[PDB]
Amino acid sequence: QSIDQLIKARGKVYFGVATDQNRLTTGKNAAIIKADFGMVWPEESMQWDATEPSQGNFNFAGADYLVNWAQQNGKLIGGGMLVWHNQLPSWVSSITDKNTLINVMKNHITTLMTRYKGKIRAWDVVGEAFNEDGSLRQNVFLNVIGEDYIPIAFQTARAADPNAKLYIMDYNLDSASYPKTQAIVNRVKQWRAAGVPIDGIGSQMHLSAGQGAGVLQALPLLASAGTPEVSILMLDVAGASPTDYVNVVNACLNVQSCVGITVFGVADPDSWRASSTPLLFDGNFNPKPAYNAIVQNLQQ
Numbered sequence: 001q002s003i004d005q006l007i008k009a010r011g012k013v014y015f016g017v018a019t020d021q022n023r024l025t026t027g028k029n030a031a032i033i034k035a036d037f038g039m040v041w042p043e044e045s046m047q048w049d050a051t052e053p054s055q056g057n058f059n060f061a062g063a064d065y066l067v068n069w070a071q072q073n074g075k076l077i078g079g080g081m082l083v084w085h086n087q088l089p090s091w092v093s094s095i096t097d098k099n100t101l102i103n104v105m106k107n108h109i110t111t112l113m114t115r116y117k118g119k120i121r122a123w124d125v126v127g128e129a130f131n132e133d134g135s136l137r138q139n140v141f142l143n144v145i146g147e148d149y150i151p152i153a154f155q156t157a158r159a160a161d162p163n164a165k166l167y168i169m170d171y172n173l174d175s176a177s178y179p180k181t182q183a184i185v186n187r188v189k190q191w192r193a194a195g196v197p198i199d200g201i202g203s204q205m206h207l208s209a210g211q212g213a214g215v216l217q218a219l220p221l222l223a224s225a226g227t228p229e230v231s232i233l234m235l236d237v238a239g240a241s242p243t244d245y246v247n248v249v250n251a252c253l254n255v256q257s258c259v260g261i262t263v264f265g266v267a268d269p270d271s272w273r274a275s276s277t278p279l280l281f282d283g284n285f286n287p288k289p290a291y292n293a294i295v296q297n298l299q300q
Contacts (some may be wrong), residue, residue, distance in 0.1 A: 003280075003291065004038035006298035007260065010253060013121075014039040014076055016262035019063040021045065027070065030069075034064035039121065040074035041233070041262055042066050046079045047087035053149055055091055055104065058111055067116055067196050078262070080124025081169075082109050083153045085139035092187055095141040101144045104251055106156045115159035120153065122231070124202060125157045129169050134183025151196045159196040169202035172292040188225040191273040200229040205248065206264075209239040212247030219251040219258060230263040236271060236278035242293035245280070249294055 003062040015041030015130050018219055021151045023029040023043075033040065045062030052058050063079075070077040082088070083105060113123060129150060131137050141149040150168075157166050166187065173181045188198055201222050205215070223230050232252055237244045252258040267281040268288075280291040 001295045001299075002036045002293050003298060005008065006295060007249075008038065010298055012252065012258070012260050014260040014262075016041060016076070016078070016260060017266060018043045018262060018264050019066070019266070021062045023033040023266070023270065024065075024069060027270075031268075032266050032285060033075070034073050038077070039078060039260065039262065040066060040070050041078040046112065047081060048092065048108060049087045049089050050086065052108055053089060056107065059190045060115060060264060061288060063112075063115075067119065071119070071174075076121045077116070078118060078122050079112065079120045080167075081127040082112060082123060082125050082157065082165035083141060083149070084127040085137070086128070088140070090207030095140070096144060098145050102152060103156065104150075104245065105141065105145075105149065105153060109114045109120070109153060109156045110160045113157060113164065118163050118277075120161065120164050120169055120279045122200065122229075123157060123161075124169050124233075125153050125166050126168045127204075128170055129168065129178055130184055130187075131170060132180050135177040148236060150191065151194065152197045154191075154198055166197055166201040167202045167229075167231065168198055169204050171199075171206060171235060172233075173203045173206065173222060174205065174211055174218050175214045176221040178218075181218055181221055185221060186229060192226060198227055200231055200259075201225060202225050202231045202233045205232050205236075206234065207237040207248075208240055209237070209243060209244065212237065212241075215248050215251040216254070219255045223255045223257045228254060228257065229259045230257050231259055234264040236264045236273070237267070237290075238273070238276040238278050238282065240268075240278050240288055240290045242290045245290040246293050246297050249297055
């Protein structure tokens with residue numbers, strides 16, 4: 001059975017997967033994504049380096065492929081990351097002055113979001129903005145623009161496509177007792193009180209074995225910031241224990257504002273941490289125990 005169809009039958013929006021053109025042209029990726037997932041997210045083709053490798057010179061080869069593929073196959077599409085320290089060209093991080101970086105960042109956001117206006121469910125606007133202690137990460141945007149880069153990024157994104165859900169995302173938000181989890185909640189509440197249009201918090205969930213259980217209390221904490229939505233993204237779990245994956249699913253089922261879950265690829269050999277067998281399909285492109293356990297958990 002399709003975990004996407006089953007999660008929809010439980011009232012959620014999607015079970016999604018990260019992918020890109022290079023995956024869709026090889027192996028059994030396209031067939032599995034067509035059968036079992038309802039939303040695709042670009043692993044790399046909408047990152048800053050892929051789309052704006054030099055200032056003001058945009059390209060959408062991989063991004064257009066994925067957007068057109070999603071539409072042709074009836075899948076929702078997410079986009080990102082708009083503003084991130086990873087996959088960021090040195091021409092951007094070499095900018096040292098606030099107004100130039102503001103203008104570059106606004107142009108980047110607006111150009112990407114305008115190209116696909118009305119077609120993208122959600123954009124990851126800002127990623128990995130927090131240190132583990134809950135202070136803001138000293139990326140080039142914080143260092144050069146200051147903390148107003150986050151308000152500016154979200155205001156610009158809303159103007160570029162008011163139909164898209166605008167997310168901030170981060171990792172290590174997997175325990176309600178961890179400072180990072182509490183900090184993003186407190187800061188998002190304050191940003192929203194200041195008028196920053198943050199529609200969602202996305203939890204980038206790269207778990208180690210046994211960490212799923214902590215999400216049961218962490219995800220409701222994230223939802224307490226008052227965003228209309230939360231989501232789970234880039235999900236993978238070392239060992240892919242059925243119990244870890246079922247805990248993550250249950251957390252989303254128990255959080256009304258959790259719209260859905262995206263896994264960070266299809267088959268184990270293709271994961272960035274392939275040897276940890278952390279995905280839902282094995283090296284034969286067959287469903288693993290964790291896939292079947294999610295199916296069982298969603299049936300009814």
